[PDB]
Write a structure and sequence with these properties.
This is part of a larger assembly, with 4 copies of chain A.
Chain A (H helix, E strand, L loop, with lengths): L1 H9 L22 H19 L4 E8 H7 L10 H7 L6 E2 L6 E3 L9 E6 L17 E9 L1
Antiparallel strand pairs in A: 2-3, 3-4
PDB class: toxin
Keywords: Bacterial toxin, Tc toxin, toxin
Entry title: Photorhabdus luminescens TcdA1 prepore-to-pore intermediate, K1179W mutant
Chain lengths: 146, 146, 293, 48
């Protein structure tokens, strides 16, 4: 089942379950149990390689300053230059709105910490490529520069 | 012909601008004598785009084959990220068991199409201003003779 | 079903002959009356048993995830039935399942599709629960086990049992009806098995020629080490005389009943140490009747 | 699996935190975070 989780992650098929119960039967001392499990794994590998395809690996630079400059007027656009230098002066303040807000941390050991939150939906990354190329888009790695 | 430059046809590609190149018109086969090898096959395709991309800004374009049948699942198109000797993958490894995109494709026949989504300035496409700076395109065709 | 109080004299004589023949057959077969009743029984006990429960568990686990269009349900279910019901061969279980589907056992007529659907929906393995249809499931399992008791008691070969299940008409059962495990059919199945065993090494070709419309007097005579003219003339005599069912050249060796009639003619001729024309002359001596001169 | 692998682009929230920011608490980052102008994320995402 641990391999089941890996297959349901590498492929988005959360519904697909291949390991079935009853492979162990106490009537017959549980004999052949491992050969049923082995057949289940062979079916799981057959379906895994059947479904796998080379995915278009893409990279996109995301500019936090530009994104926070760009969010709708009612969300209050702001360049990070004039709020980073003022939230450091006093941490009780807040900036931005929604999931794109810039404010200090809430948890008891994070009141000093300042966190900038970015919403993936507001990043509008999905439409950067036509939907015919691929129905699903998944993050493979995240790199940050400061 | 197959060397035309025109916008995309499919319903989600009307904004995309694709440049199509015919492999037969590329006259690559005659570059070496026929005694060296009867068959010529593509092992890897790399693209360069010397566009005036900004700092922390990037191109997004996808070059695809024309057949999409003879070849392993998903090997028919790779998307360019930054366009400087850049293939679709993040680390390419010739020693990997994976067939690289466009592997085993015959040089003599075939069509290669490189597409740029969101080109049309009437739709204010994200590439529109930058694609104007595009001067020339390079493909680094890695092909083998055997 | 017939009552002895209100019965005809000829019917009573026929009943006496049937009882004597079946008792003699049972004595020859070393069979108790109870065994014959079990093999010919139709009422089935509706009580879950550990053997039946194990059968259900194995079938449910094996058939889980089965796709109807991908493969036949019966063929997929046969190996698990063979494993659970103590069978030597898988195709024996397949034939038994086909026969059961034609019989539709139990008070609630049960078949492979219905059994599989009940197991898929209303069955929870490993727990003792009360289900309204569970008694019909038990009856179907008991019928399957009984049809095993049939196959093993008869002693017939596996492929001729397959032929009997698929085409009762070849064995001369009433056309268009499922084969009977009635004692009347049981005795003829036993006689067929005995004839196949008597054929010895030739049986392999004889059965193949019988399953096709291929078998002839000469081939069967070579198989039984008898004169071909003897079998041909026995068949001629059987065709000439009014049997029920009638014997015609296009069924005389195609159907098992016609073959049995021809072999009975041959047996009676060799008992009397005369040609079949001798038996034909004998049976003409109906001097105590008004039907004919 | 690399960190943030298999995460859907369409929905989700990404939060980058800087501990010890507040200058009232003399946080170690306080003086340096004032020099921070802009942030970049290099999102490696795949299409399939």
């Amino acid at each position: 089942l641990m391999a089941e989780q890996a297959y349901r992650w590498e492929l988005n098929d959360d519904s697909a379950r291949f390991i079935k119960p009853g492979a162990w039967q106490g009537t017959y001392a549980g004999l052949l149990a491992g050969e049923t499990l082995m057949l289940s794994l062979a079916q799981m590998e057959d379906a895994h390689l059947k479904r796998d395809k080379r995915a278009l690996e893409v990279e996109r630079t995301v500019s936090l300053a530009e994104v926070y400059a760009g969010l709708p007027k009612d969300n209050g656009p702001f360049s990070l230059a004039q709020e980073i230098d003022k939230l450091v002066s006093q941490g009780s303040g807040s900036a931005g709105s929604g999931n794109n807000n810039l404010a200090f941390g809430a948890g008891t050991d994070t009141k000093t910490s300042l966190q900038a939150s970015v919403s993936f939906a507001d990043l509008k990354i999905r439409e950067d490529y036509p939907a015919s190329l691929g129905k699903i888009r998944r993050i493979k790695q995240i790199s940050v520069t400061l | 012909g197959n060397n035309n430059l025109a916008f995309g046809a499919g319903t989600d590609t009307k904004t995309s601008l694709q440049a199509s190149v015919s492999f037969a018109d590329l006259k690559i086969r005659e570059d070496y004598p026929a005694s060296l090898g009867k068959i010529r096959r593509i092992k890897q395709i790399s693209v360069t785009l010397p566009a005036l991309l900004g700092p922390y800004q990037d191109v997004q374009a996808i070059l695809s084959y024309g057949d999409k049948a003879g070849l392993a699942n998903g090997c028919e198109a790779l998307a360019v990220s930054h366009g400087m000797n850049d293939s679709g993958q993040f680390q390419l490894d010739f020693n990997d068991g994976k067939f690289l995109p466009f592997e085993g494709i015959a040089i003599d026949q075939g069509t290669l199409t490189l597409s740029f989504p969101n080109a049309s300035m009437p739709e204010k496409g994200k590439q529109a201003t930058m694609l104007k700076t595009l001067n020339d395109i390079i493909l680094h065709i890695r092909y083998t003779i055997k | 079903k017939t009552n002895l109080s209100a019965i005809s004299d000829k019917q009573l004589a026929t009943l006496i002959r049937k009882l004597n023949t079946i008792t003699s057959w049972l004595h020859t077969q070393k069979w108790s009356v109870f065994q014959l009743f079990i093999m010919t029984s139709t009422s089935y006990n509706k009580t879950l048993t550990p053997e039946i429960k194990n059968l259900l568990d194995t079938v449910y686990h094996g058939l889980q995830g089965f796709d109807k269009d991908k493969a036949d349900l019966l063929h997929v279910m046969a190996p698990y039935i063979a494993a659970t019901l103590q069978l030597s061969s898988e195709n024996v279980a397949h034939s038994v399942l086909l026969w059961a589907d034609k019989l539709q056992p139990g008070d609630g007529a049960m078949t492979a599709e219905k059994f599989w659907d009940w197991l898929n929906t209303k069955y929870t393995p490993g727990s003792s629960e009360a289900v309204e249809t569970q008694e019909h499931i038990v009856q179907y399992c008991q019928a399957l086990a009984q049809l095993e008791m049939v196959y093993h008691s008869t002693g017939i070969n596996e492929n001729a049992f397959r032929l009997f299940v698929t085409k009762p008409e070849m064995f001369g059962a009433a056309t268009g009806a499922a084969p009977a495990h009635d004692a009347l059919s049981l005795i003829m199945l036993t006689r067929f098995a005995d004839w196949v065993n008597a054929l010895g090494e030739k049986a392999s070709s004889v059965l193949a020629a019988f399953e096709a419309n291929s078998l002839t007097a000469e081939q069967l005579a070579d198989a039984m080490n008898l004169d071909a003219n003897l079998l041909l003339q026995a068949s001629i005599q059987a065709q000439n005389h009014q049997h029920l069912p009638p014997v015609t050249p296009e069924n005389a060796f195609s159907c098992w009943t016609s073959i049995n009639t021809i072999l009975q003619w041959v047996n009676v001729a060799q008992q009397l140490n005369v040609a079949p024309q001798g038996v034909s002359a004998l049976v003409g001596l109906d001097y105590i009747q008004s039907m004919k001169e």
